[PDB]
Design an enzyme around this catalytic site. Structure first.
Site, PDB file in Angstrom:
ATOM      1  N   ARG A  50      31.437 -25.726   9.016  1.00 46.31           N
ATOM      2  CA  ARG A  50      30.892 -24.940   7.913  1.00 46.31           C
ATOM      3  C   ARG A  50      32.051 -24.569   6.992  1.00 46.31           C
ATOM      4  O   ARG A  50      32.972 -23.838   7.388  1.00 46.31           O
ATOM      5  CB  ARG A  50      30.191 -23.689   8.449  1.00 46.31           C
ATOM      6  CG  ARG A  50      29.373 -22.951   7.393  1.00 46.31           C
ATOM      7  CD  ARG A  50      28.526 -21.821   7.988  1.00 46.31           C
ATOM      8  NE  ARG A  50      27.520 -21.326   7.043  1.00 46.31           N
ATOM      9  CZ  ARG A  50      27.477 -20.098   6.537  1.00 46.31           C
ATOM     10  NH1 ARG A  50      28.374 -19.178   6.878  1.00 46.31           N
ATOM     11  NH2 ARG A  50      26.506 -19.789   5.696  1.00 46.31           N
TER      12      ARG A  50
ATOM     13  N   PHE B 252      35.003 -18.831   0.000  1.00 52.17           N
ATOM     14  CA  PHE B 252      34.619 -17.955   1.104  1.00 52.17           C
ATOM     15  C   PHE B 252      35.456 -18.248   2.346  1.00 52.17           C
ATOM     16  O   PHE B 252      36.392 -17.499   2.619  1.00 52.17           O
ATOM     17  CB  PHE B 252      33.099 -18.064   1.333  1.00 52.17           C
ATOM     18  CG  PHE B 252      32.548 -17.223   2.461  1.00 52.17           C
ATOM     19  CD1 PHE B 252      33.245 -16.144   2.990  1.00 52.17           C
ATOM     20  CD2 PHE B 252      31.304 -17.533   2.991  1.00 52.17           C
ATOM     21  CE1 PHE B 252      32.697 -15.379   4.030  1.00 52.17           C
ATOM     22  CE2 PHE B 252      30.758 -16.771   4.015  1.00 52.17           C
ATOM     23  CZ  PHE B 252      31.460 -15.704   4.543  1.00 52.17           C
TER      24      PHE B 252
ATOM     25  N   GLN C 228      35.081 -22.559   8.630  1.00 53.43           N
ATOM     26  CA  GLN C 228      34.762 -22.155  10.014  1.00 53.43           C
ATOM     27  C   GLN C 228      34.748 -23.341  10.962  1.00 53.43           C
ATOM     28  O   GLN C 228      34.142 -24.395  10.696  1.00 53.43           O
ATOM     29  CB  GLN C 228      33.401 -21.455  10.082  1.00 53.43           C
ATOM     30  CG  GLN C 228      32.954 -21.111  11.505  1.00 53.43           C
ATOM     31  CD  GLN C 228      31.862 -20.051  11.547  1.00 53.43           C
ATOM     32  OE1 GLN C 228      31.714 -19.275  10.613  1.00 53.43           O
ATOM     33  NE2 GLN C 228      31.127 -19.993  12.651  1.00 53.43           N
TER      34      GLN C 228
ATOM     35  N   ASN D  21      31.250 -14.601  15.051  1.00 57.88           N
ATOM     36  CA  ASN D  21      30.449 -13.999  16.109  1.00 57.88           C
ATOM     37  C   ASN D  21      28.986 -13.918  15.709  1.00 57.88           C
ATOM     38  O   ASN D  21      28.655 -14.200  14.562  1.00 57.88           O
ATOM     39  CB  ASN D  21      31.009 -12.617  16.523  1.00 57.88           C
ATOM     40  CG  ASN D  21      30.833 -11.565  15.460  1.00 57.88           C
ATOM     41  OD1 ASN D  21      29.760 -11.447  14.851  1.00 57.88           O
ATOM     42  ND2 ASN D  21      31.875 -10.768  15.240  1.00 57.88           N
TER      43      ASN D  21
ATOM     44  N   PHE E 108      37.160 -18.388  11.756  1.00 55.69           N
ATOM     45  CA  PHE E 108      37.170 -18.816  10.373  1.00 55.69           C
ATOM     46  C   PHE E 108      38.506 -18.473   9.729  1.00 55.69           C
ATOM     47  O   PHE E 108      39.203 -17.532  10.151  1.00 55.69           O
ATOM     48  CB  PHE E 108      35.989 -18.267   9.576  1.00 55.69           C
ATOM     49  CG  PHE E 108      35.899 -16.753   9.551  1.00 55.69           C
ATOM     50  CD1 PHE E 108      35.375 -16.043  10.629  1.00 55.69           C
ATOM     51  CD2 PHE E 108      36.290 -16.028   8.430  1.00 55.69           C
ATOM     52  CE1 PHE E 108      35.247 -14.657  10.578  1.00 55.69           C
ATOM     53  CE2 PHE E 108      36.172 -14.649   8.402  1.00 55.69           C
ATOM     54  CZ  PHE E 108      35.652 -13.969   9.452  1.00 55.69           C
TER      55      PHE E 108
ATOM     56  N   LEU F 225      33.565  -7.867   5.890  1.00 57.13           N
ATOM     57  CA  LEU F 225      33.643  -8.222   7.316  1.00 57.13           C
ATOM     58  C   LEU F 225      34.540  -7.298   8.134  1.00 57.13           C
ATOM     59  O   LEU F 225      34.574  -7.394   9.363  1.00 57.13           O
ATOM     60  CB  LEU F 225      34.124  -9.674   7.462  1.00 57.13           C
ATOM     61  CG  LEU F 225      33.243 -10.713   6.753  1.00 57.13           C
ATOM     62  CD1 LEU F 225      33.829 -12.136   6.923  1.00 57.13           C
ATOM     63  CD2 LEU F 225      31.802 -10.656   7.255  1.00 57.13           C
TER      64      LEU F 225
ATOM     65  N   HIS G 192      34.255  -8.344  12.324  1.00 63.01           N
ATOM     66  CA  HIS G 192      34.944  -9.521  12.842  1.00 63.01           C
ATOM     67  C   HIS G 192      36.382  -9.166  13.122  1.00 63.01           C
ATOM     68  O   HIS G 192      37.019  -8.489  12.308  1.00 63.01           O
ATOM     69  CB  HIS G 192      34.872 -10.673  11.834  1.00 63.01           C
ATOM     70  CG  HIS G 192      33.483 -11.143  11.595  1.00 63.01           C
ATOM     71  ND1 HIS G 192      32.917 -12.170  12.314  1.00 63.01           N
ATOM     72  CD2 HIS G 192      32.520 -10.694  10.760  1.00 63.01           C
ATOM     73  CE1 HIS G 192      31.669 -12.349  11.915  1.00 63.01           C
ATOM     74  NE2 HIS G 192      31.401 -11.462  10.976  1.00 63.01           N
TER      75      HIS G 192
END
Length: 164
Positions: A54, A59, A62, A101, A112, A121, A125
């Protein structure tokens, strides 16, 4: 000294470049150790050969789902999942390395690499490292991503391990 690990990245099997990371073992030792071990493969499983499934430009990239290659798998060196260790470190900009997660206390192997500040986040995270060398290679990977995260070529960790 904090460990350094490297990924050698490939695009449809063709070498792209190397990314290295400082792991913050001095602040998040359990989380750092999981990633370090998965990168050397010393427990008998880990990141070598796995993909970045991903990749969303602007952004994050991942990866780490070495069992199902799509975001549904992975496991830690401690077991299927482990707790959120702490939230001392924040998502301050590009290059931050943080755990993916699926809810509180569900860390596995997926992680990521931020390519933007992702402050929303913070506290959700666990941040445990940052890109040292090869942020330009992360930017090159990002170009193979898309808005929905599907990659336009297979992005792989062709090799990985620990640097002196």
């Amino acid at each position: 000294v904090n460990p350094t690990v490297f990924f050698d990245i490939a695009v449809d099997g063709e070498p792209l470049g190397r990314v290295s990371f400082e792991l913050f073992a001095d602040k998040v030792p359990k989380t750092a150790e999981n990633f370090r071990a998965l990168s050397t493969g010393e427990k008998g499983f880990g990141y070598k050969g796995s993909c970045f499934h991903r990749i969303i430009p602007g952004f994050m990239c991942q990866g780490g789902d070495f069992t199902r290659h799509n975001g549904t798998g992975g496991k830690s060196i401690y077991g299927e999942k482990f707790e959120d260790e702490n939230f001392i470190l924040k998502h301050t900009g590009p290059g931050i390395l943080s755990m993916a997660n699926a809810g509180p206390n569900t860390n596995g192997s997926q992680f990521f690499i931020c390519t933007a500040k992702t402050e929303w986040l913070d506290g959700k995270h666990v941040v445990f490292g940052k890109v040292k060398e090869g942020m330009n290679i992360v930017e090159a990977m990002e170009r193979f991503g898309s808005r929905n995260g599907k990659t336009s070529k297979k992005i792989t960790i062709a090799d990985c391990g620990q640097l002196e």
